[PDB]
């Protein structure tokens, strides 16, 4: 009775140190929750995809010449096809239900910090947030600044948190108050951090 | 080139002739959900909310045993075409902004890893740091390359500089990537 992620099954093939690599990827693509769901099972030899099972095609297709004997043999067996055709629901749709109650519910509130760079740049570090969906805005005395604003790309930390640095080039006049405005799905109302000239 | 709101790999199965080595993991939106330890035969979850689920290590063992058969067949049909060593791209950064005294985590992203055989070590003043060191599995890339991230728990200090040391077959000598506060 514990729930379990269902895996996609590799099909056995018919019939400086040197290295030979093989990868099998059971890819699941989801759009609009479970409205559109596509399965793409890729077999890769070294860095070349040789054979594929695209659920939108409903058949093994040889991507390279190496995937040829495998796409002909696996396609000649209705057992294999009957199974890969189901995998979109058995693997992709099944596991998304598990994600709905766990990964697609993960929320880590961002940590917003402002610091001048060590010619006049304020750096707003938005660290340790999840999901990716983030919106950062810069204000100089409640007026939005865009022209002098540059961001880094989204930084994946690898431990299930993201990081982003949003920089603003400014000319400080005494009494100026700059505000980093961060919006994120884990927040009740936007985070507002102030920096005073 | 596919567009989707979410993307999962309900099977990043990997097998190599070098070792021979294997790797079984599940990914969700580019993050590692778990890996099966093929030697200990156990599923190790990477996100603690996932520990409520089970994943039979024998699912992974059967898949890697099939990949081993396919690898051998592909070595035959390709006339022994071996992998070409790629040049890894290393970047050292921090989990949070640096404040001396306040604990932080030094992050070492090693990108463009191919074949998936690499050594990621940490140095402080030329000596290896072994405690507080952890790492992700090889995480897949769309171009069938891999990346791996290594971590080091730190207490920053003005007179303490660190390095991320990477050893790969595609590098002439160890790539050292410096970080300092």
């Amino acid at each position, epitope marked *: 009775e514990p729930e*379990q992620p*269902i*895996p996609e*099954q590799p*099909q*056995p093939y*018919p019939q400086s140190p040197e290295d030979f690599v093989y990868q099998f990827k059971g890819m699941c693509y989801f759009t609009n929750g479970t409205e559109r769901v596509r399965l793409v099972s890729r077999s890769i030899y070294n860095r070349e995809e040789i054979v594929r099972f695209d659920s939108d095609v409903g058949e093994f297709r040889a991507v390279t010449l190496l995937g040829l004997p495998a796409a002909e043999y696996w396609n000649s*067996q209705k*057992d*294999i096809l*009957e*199974r890969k055709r189901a995998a979109v629901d*058995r693997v992709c749709r099944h596991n998304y239900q598990l994600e709905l109650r766990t990964t697609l519910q993960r929320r880590v509130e961002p940590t917003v910090t402002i610091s001048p760079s060590r010619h006049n740049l304020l750096v707003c570090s938005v660290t340790d947030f999840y999901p990716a969906q983030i919106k950062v805005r810069w204000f100089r005395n409640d007026q939005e600044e865009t022209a002098g604003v540059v961001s880094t790309p989204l930084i994946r930390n690898g431990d299930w948190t993201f990081q982003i640095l949003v920089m603003l080039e400014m000319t400080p006049q005494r009494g100026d108050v700059y505000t980093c405005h961060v919006e994120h799905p884990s927040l009740q109302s936007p985070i507002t951090v102030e920096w005073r000239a | 080139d596919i567009v989707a709101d979410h993307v999962a790999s309900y099977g990043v199965n990997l097998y190599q002739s070098y*070792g*021979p080595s*294997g790797q079984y993991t599940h990914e969700f939106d580019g993050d590692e959900q778990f890996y099966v330890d*093929l*030697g*200990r*035969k156990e599923t190790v979850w990477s996100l603690p909310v996932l520990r409520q689920f089970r994943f*039979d290590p*024998q*699912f992974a*063992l*059967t898949n890697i*045993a*099939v990949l*081993k*058969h396919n690898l051998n067949s592909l070595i035959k049909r390709s006339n022994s075409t071996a992998a070409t060593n790629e040049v890894p791209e290393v970047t050292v950064f921090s989990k949070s902004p640096v404040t001396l005294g306040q604990p932080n985590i030094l992050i070492c992203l090693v990108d463009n890893i191919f074949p998936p055989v690499v050594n990621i070590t940490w140095l402080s003043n030329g000596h290896s740091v072994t405690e507080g060191v952890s790492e992700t599995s090889f995480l897949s890339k769309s171009d069938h390359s891999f990346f791996k991230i290594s971590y080091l728990t730190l207490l920053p200090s003005a007179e303490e500089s660190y390095d991320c040391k990477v050893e790969h077959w595609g590098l002439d000598k160890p790539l050292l990537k410096h970080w300092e506060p």
Partner: antibody
Amino acid sequence: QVQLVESGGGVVQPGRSLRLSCAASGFTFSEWYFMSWVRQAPGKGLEWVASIDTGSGSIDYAGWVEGRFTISRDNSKNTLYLQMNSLRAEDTAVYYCARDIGIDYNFWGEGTLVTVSS
Amino acid sequence: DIQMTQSPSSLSASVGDRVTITCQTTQEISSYLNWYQQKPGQPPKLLIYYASTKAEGIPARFSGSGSGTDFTLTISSLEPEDFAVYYCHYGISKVSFGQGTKVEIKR
């Protein structure tokens, strides 16, 4: 050709010990394999004894074994071993050696009878 | 360990008949259930893997279905050479086998 050949069977008195061997040929243990000992008492069903990962040396035994039997391998010799101690009439069975059970293009040996008798 | 029970323990059927043997496991195993066939004085022979995929060279009359804890082996039209004991199986390292179902031929 690929095959597994069991040897070491015959008669053995109760309480004594016996070591079965299964020699591999046409493949090498260093390619990482699950090698298993499955036994079958006359007229009874298949009963798994133990498995060994030739690579990492990982071992699994059936819950009934409880230390009496020891599975081992030698990748240099390409041979699987089953060391049985304190033999009883219950252990009279055909002992089969198998490679990666449940996966296509894999093999089982012809077997070797082990009779526990005075 | 995972345990497996087959139904029935034995059956008798005529040539041309559709034979159905079930296997039930104590735990969910996705579609990682295999079927073996053993004829007298021979080692077991893999018939089906992945619950429903037939092994290379296995006659088309042999088929499988099921997922999770409940599986079925079907012989759509029985032949006299199908006299044998059939076993469900799970596990490459921790190996479980069902108790076996003896198939006898009504002639």
